[PDB]
Amino acid sequence: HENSNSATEGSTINYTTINYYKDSYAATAGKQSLKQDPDKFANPVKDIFTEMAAPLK
Amino acid sequence: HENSNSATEGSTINYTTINYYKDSYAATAGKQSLKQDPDKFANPVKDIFTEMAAPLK
Amino acid sequence: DRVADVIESSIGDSVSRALTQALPAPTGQNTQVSSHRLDTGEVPALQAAEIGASSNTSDESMIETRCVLNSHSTAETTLDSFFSRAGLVGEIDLPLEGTTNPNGYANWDIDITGYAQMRRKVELFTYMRFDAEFTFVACTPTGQVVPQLLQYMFVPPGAPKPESRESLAWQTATNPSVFVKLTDPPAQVSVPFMSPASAYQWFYDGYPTFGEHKQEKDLEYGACPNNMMGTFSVRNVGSSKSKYPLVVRIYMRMKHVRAWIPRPMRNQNYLFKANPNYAGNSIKPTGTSRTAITTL
Amino acid sequence: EIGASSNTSDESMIETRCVLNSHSTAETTLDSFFSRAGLVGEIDLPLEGTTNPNGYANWDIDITGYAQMRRKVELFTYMRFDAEFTFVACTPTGQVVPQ
Amino acid sequence: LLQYMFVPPGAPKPESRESLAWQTATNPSVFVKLTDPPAQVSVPFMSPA
Amino acid sequence: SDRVAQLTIGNSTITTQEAANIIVGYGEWPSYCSDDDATAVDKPTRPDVSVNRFYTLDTKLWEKSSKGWYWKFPDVLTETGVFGQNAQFHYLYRSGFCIHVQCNASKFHQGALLVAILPEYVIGTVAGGTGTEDSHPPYKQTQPGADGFELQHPYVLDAGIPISQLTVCPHQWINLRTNNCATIIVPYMNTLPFDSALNHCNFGLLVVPISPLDFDQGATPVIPITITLAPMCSEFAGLRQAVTQ
Amino acid sequence: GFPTEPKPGTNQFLTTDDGVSAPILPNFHPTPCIHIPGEVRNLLELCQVETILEVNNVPTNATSLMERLRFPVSAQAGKGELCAVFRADPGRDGPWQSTMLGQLCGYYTQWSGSLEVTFMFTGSFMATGKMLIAYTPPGGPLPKDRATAMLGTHVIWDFGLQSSVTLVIPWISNTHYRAHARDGVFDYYTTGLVSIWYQTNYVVPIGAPNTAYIIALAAAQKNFTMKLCKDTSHILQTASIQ
Amino acid sequence: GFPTEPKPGTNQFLTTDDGVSAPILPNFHPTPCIHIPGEVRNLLELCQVETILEVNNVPTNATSLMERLRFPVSAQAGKGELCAVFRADPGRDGPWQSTMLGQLCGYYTQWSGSLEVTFMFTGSFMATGKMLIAYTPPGGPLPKDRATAMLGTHVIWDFGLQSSVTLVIPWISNTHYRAHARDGVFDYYTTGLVSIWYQTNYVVPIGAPNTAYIIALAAAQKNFTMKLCKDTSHILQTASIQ
Amino acid sequence: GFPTEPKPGTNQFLTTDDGVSAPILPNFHPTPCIHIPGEVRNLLELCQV
Amino acid sequence: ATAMLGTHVIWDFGLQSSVTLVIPWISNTHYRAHARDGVFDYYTTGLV
């Protein structure tokens, strides 16, 4: 059927790859889901504020 | 599934090609739709006239 | 509340008027029956070229015609049909002894205007968008196949261009390289339409610099950076002398083509790449010549 | 000082038109960025020498020996992934031999 | 390595090994090593009759 | 109702009583840039009437031996009028044109001018005659602005291409026994939504005598040819200071 | 592995073979395609556009190259004189080479369809005249006089406001297609001859030029098609592109 | 066996070719993946993070390398003096190379999108001042004075509790994408220039430093994207890794 | 790639082998076939004459 | 070349003997008192 053993196993992203062997890590890199989360690095702030506001109230 | 990234993307013509990779630009040239528009170069006139008529009324 | 001329103001219409539509042309137009027409007022044969439109006179109105069901196809005259034929566009020498490209590596500026056959075809249109299939036929100058390993690396404009056979850029960590033995069938690859413009431009009437434009710089007139795709580098894969003289022929075949703005076909010989210069003294006519318009 | 990147939109900085940005972001994914073969190891099996005669070699699997590839990955602290190793062998002249 | 090129009546017939017609920009050519199995190709009924 | 015509744009109106219809380049009226075709994020300026009007830029004299002339376009209209200004202050420019070339003579005169629009009209040099020298056409030749430039080898349009085929381009003829003016309406044509009006010329206007001017002596011999063009759907973006080139 | 048996043709590189190939840039997405004026779909769209036919392909002085574009016609002193003559073959050497059609033909081995040739008169408004344009099908030797030429397909052109007249050269052939006609043997594919005679005479008042020119423009009719493309012969460079 | 015919490209090793390959360890099951903080999905997530822009890329004394990170601003004695100036091009040599964005660009042939450059003032609380940051689009030569610079996109920055102000460098281009700009010819792809002038003056009471510094931080806007990746040029080693 | 194992007979050119082959002219469309008298279908039609 | 920058009209001679030039009411004021050299040239209409 196919072993579920690739590096992106259980990942939150959905990949569609092609493979010819029992082991899924052999499969192609394939096309995948395009999600992002800039705020994790750009706005890791505890209390969000808006651009419209004055950052320091 | 396949990336939609060939040169004739969004084109008004319909192509039926064969492909084996994720990227659609790899796909064959393939058979395609045969439409034409001679008037764009032959009759780019603002006020059409017919052959039957005298071109300058 | 408004000023009228603002409510009307058709300023901002993103859609193009058109005037002409595209119709299905799978076969050539058929010929319907015609009969004699002796009447005043209708003159098909009479035209006015001044208008700027091609005569629309049908065979039917010029002579009594029979009926012909034209089933001849028009498929072979499409763009993909016409342009999707591999052709030579680049040639590279890797000689043992010489001054051209010793050291075992070469940097070919990706410019398809170096070979007259292919060049003329494309220069038929002003703009052209398409994907392509590049094939690389390598061998010695005698056409002899040799057990040598090469490395072809596409180097986008900005990437570090290899300075030697053992350069660090050959690690090709992000550039796409191809390793091939000259004994393996020619390497072949699919290339997307990679350009910041929407179509490659065979002719660019203008400059790119934006500066003074003196004499010494007229070198840049007609140079459009949206076509400078970077360089193609090749090298025998090693540390020492290749042992065999090599030559790589680069064949490009377009596919998924879109062409726009057809222009006159090249009339004179070609002299330089990306530059329509012609021999001033040797301006030959477009075609053959006779001795008189009254004889063949 | 807060430590967050400015969230000012082009729209609030100048009068802007409307633009339908259909440019893709697929080429900037990780698989997209990292899934490109690169040189990571090199091994010599010379006839005469002191490097690796005797006809065999033991290469410690460490991809940090080649600057191009190394810098790319050292962009992140941690990395999980599968890989495709390819081995291009030949003589020092790039000549292919029946060995 | 050889190069076989089909030259339709009207196309420029090569005058030398290094002739320009070998750019084969529209003519259909086939490049083959004599070590590769014989080249083989499919040809349509091309005639005005 | 086909030989007489009136063109009105901005505050300018052209009249003609012997025109031979109007050609619309590649069968497409000039349009503004779509929201999905554009990239420049700043809201552009559309001066409308202050720049979309009829500028009568130049006059040439047709002589029994004239070779022909050309005018590169985006450029020709710079420095002249409010259009000129918006083209210097802004980086990005976009616009279609209504070109009206006029030239009249008597019913006793004869001749025929070819009036074409050649997109991306790159000029080439004679390469030092022999063809060994890699010369390049000077700024004064590639971007002559108004006044245009005279052709030196019209047969090849000073660019190695047959003029015999120049008609695959929006064209119109000025046959003196038939009309006295040409009218082409070119849409914006480039591989980009906007470009610098300064260093890039979308197309050139060609006016070449294919059938030589001629007339028995005694008939007024001064036969001028006047160019009158009008921008349409002009749009400008990327405002900075004013730039000449 | 899955049992396979490679057939002849293996490893061959066939120029016109249309197959697939490993793509160099994964996930690459091309610049959106803007809308651009005058897009072409089929070369036939171009073959129907009229371009100047160099009927007067005689001058070569390089200072007279421009006069190939038009032929003259002037007050004759007799009856039915011959103005001009030319091969009605498109892919052949001659006047048809100055045309856009002519050039595109050089790229295709065969063609079929009717051709049209519009003749625009550029004389003065005061000049009158009636010409007889005659297309003489295959086998018909170049007519010796008007009275003979007229036995084939023709058209009497009268000078008036309508400057030009078009002569349709109907597709009259034994074969469905025509390979390019070229003197030896291949003259089998010849289209025929076109000759222009003076139906009456070029008339003018005192004060108008006694000689004017006609400009010929040619293209293909709606039923025109071409097949089996090759490379052009008309041209091939000499020096290698610097 | 099943009839097959191998096509050109056979046996070639294409770096970026994404296919399959025989797996070395059958039935192998990788260590479960724990949950780890700060996972990245797309490099664009990084291009939006502001990093220090070395506007003052002048010092090289190796003992003064740290002062490239900030440029000075001090009490002027006149009107509209020029503080600093720089190319607004990201993938070009210059200040942008000290940024994270700059570095990631070196990996992609082209890009598109607006850029943002936040300027944080580090002077004393008592210091007042109004600066005029101006982005001059392509074709606009480096402004000779404030009165000229202001004709382009700009912003008057006032010093207050809100230490920093951001200058957005909107994507104003003729092309949809930009390849890296680099002096010769490729200056076609230049983004423009940024200049900082004194709107008024740096004011201070008796007791505060007569000179302070501004630190520039830059990144890409939400509409920023890059395509067609290559290798960086900015760097390449010399000695081989020991 | 998809795992395959070439069997004997590989690369052999068998005169009477009826397989396919890359076509030289893409989109080529042959001259319509007119109606012609006395068409043959099987040689046996001739053996009875 | 300078005159043409204002309101104009290219007149072509033909059967229609005459052409009319409209001098549109282009003024800052709603009405105009008679224009007359000194100061009152404020009310001038312009030049043809």
Ligand SMILES: Cc1cc(CCCCCCCOc2ccc(C3=NCCO3)cc2)on1
């Ligand atoms: C693997 C591999 C693949 C390659 C080569 C990839 C080449 C992609 C080339 C795309 C070329 O598009 C062009 C468009 C225009 C012009 C041009 N030359 C003069 C001005 O226009 C040349 C090439 O290298 N290695």
Ligand SMILES: Cc1cc(CCCCCCCOc2ccc(C3=NCCO3)cc2)on1
């Ligand atoms: C058949 C066959 C296949 C092979 C090679 C298998 C190699 C698997 C390698 C996985 C490597 O993962 C690495 C992770 C980290 C580092 C590292 N070097 C410095 C610290 O991190 C190197 C490799 O050999 N024979």
